[PDB]
Design a protein around this ligand. Sequence first.
Ligand SMILES: *[C@@H]1O[C@H](CO)[C@@H](O)[C@H](O)[C@H]1NC(C)=O
Ligand SMILES: NC1=NCc2ccccc21
Ligand code: NA
Ligand code: NA
Lengths: 250, 11, 28
Amino acid sequence: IVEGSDAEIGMSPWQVMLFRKSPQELLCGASLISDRWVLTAAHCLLYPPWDKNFTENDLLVRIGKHSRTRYERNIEKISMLEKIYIHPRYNWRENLDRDIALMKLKKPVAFSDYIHPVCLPDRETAASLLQAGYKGRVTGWGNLKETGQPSVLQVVNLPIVERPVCKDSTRIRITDNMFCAGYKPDEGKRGDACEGDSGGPFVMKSPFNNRWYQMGIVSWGEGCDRDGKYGFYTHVFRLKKWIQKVIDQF
Amino acid sequence: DFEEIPEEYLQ
Amino acid sequence: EADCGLRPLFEKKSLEDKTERELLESYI
Ligand SMILES: *[C@@H]1O[C@H](CO)[C@@H](O)[C@H](O)[C@H]1NC(C)=O
Ligand SMILES: NC1=NCc2ccccc21
Ligand code: NA
Ligand code: NA
């Protein structure tokens, strides 16, 4: 996260770290959506242009974390993966359309002050909140600058951007399964996701019921915090029927 | 530069 | 799911975090 700040303790208790077993390293962010299911970006697990194709046994998920590098004894919980599910129409060839994946844990994780699931949006919450100018919150342990790394989880609040502005910022084909967020050059304020934040959540706090909803997944961007560029996020609600199908059948 | 995790999770 | 999105150290104790008001103020 570029131009963010240190998270408060327990501020994002649905935050998940995807952790490579060997070599031990951060792979991506992710989010907890129930005691057995973790949501992330498909490109965190499968990206053939970079020879990336992780299997269940390559990975762990670390939940309840704050420090990036420490083993947070008595606080974090480390879980093994039972199965990965990648969206069947994830488009890694062109533009990361449908950049979404689910990971089922081998055993349910115990909730705590530091470990708690985020809600997924319904149609009405998505319609009300996914409007240009409305701000969401992005969290992760990724790089602090494009070209360095944080001691603890970082957080930044960013406004959703009008779709024509998103499209006009890039040569990539933008789809209805994506939205973009970030400040414009003349808005003064700054902030973006960066390498390592991939797969983490873009959340919004509903003013109707005071619950946090995951509206986006950190998907891609052109540089980190570049003027005139925006971060792109997977549109969770648009892919929710697939989410439900996977969970209701596995 | 990550602290070693308990070996029980890597087995 | 029934309890989703309500943080133990914030909403469940009626404590606000330092920047959530920025989000609320954007929801016009
Ligand atoms: C990814 O790897 C799995 C086996 O680990 C294989 O079944 C799948 O076809 C691979 N996909 C690509 C695009 O390489
Ligand atoms: N928003 C983003 N800028 C750079 C980047 C890398 C990976 C994921 C998201 C972004
Ligand atoms: Na364009
Ligand atoms: Na920018």
